[PDB]
With several copies, the nearest count.
Chain A
């Protein structure tokens, strides 16, 4: 699913003014969307 999201969402960004660290910044903020880095998140949160 990650592969699928990257393929789609990155095509939308083609032609934008992006320097190397711009991608690092944005890609980091994006992947955080699916991260649950809590001490002890409940199984429901861990699932989504």
Chain B
């Protein structure tokens, strides 16, 4: 209760009352923006009215990506050989922005990962 409590009436009654006069207190409104876009590699089966919004800030941005679960199934030209009919299909997964670095790309693509392993073996000479 926001009314303020008082004791039962006596001959002498003392009450603290804040002198705000008739001033109407007010609430500051935040500036909220809504970013709408294709943040995944596929459309969702859930209806627009059912899928929920996600609050994002500096202290949880990466957490949000992790929870959103990103995945890319795609095919690129296979240039590790000399055949125009050679194609390479990859299945990339992302938890944070660091996962878009070439370092991560290689680690999630065996066809390159093994070549990196080779590189290290050659360096070890």
Contacts and interface: CB of A to CB of B under 8 A. Distances in A.
B14 A8 contact: no
A48 interface: no
A11 B29 contact: no
Interface residues of A, number: 14
Interface string B3-25: 00000000110101000000010
Contact of B27 (A1, A6, A8, A10): A8
B49 interface: no
B31 to A, nearest CB: 9
Contacts of B27: 8-9
A7 B14 contact: yes
A3 interface: yes
Interface in A1-43: 1, 3-14, 26
B26 interface: yes
B29 A14 contact: no
Nearest to A5: B29
B32 to A, nearest CB: 10
A33 to B, nearest CB: 9
Contacts of A8: 27, 29
21 contacts: A1-B29, A3-B14, A3-B16, A4-B29, A5-B29, A6-B12, A6-B14, A7-B12, A7-B14, A8-B27, A8-B29, A9-B24, A9-B26, A9-B27, A10-B12, A11-B11, A11-B12, A12-B24, A13-B24, A14-B11, A26-B24
Nearest 8 A-B pairs (CB), nearest first? A3-B14, A10-B12, A4-B29, A9-B26, A6-B14, A7-B12, A7-B14, A11-B12
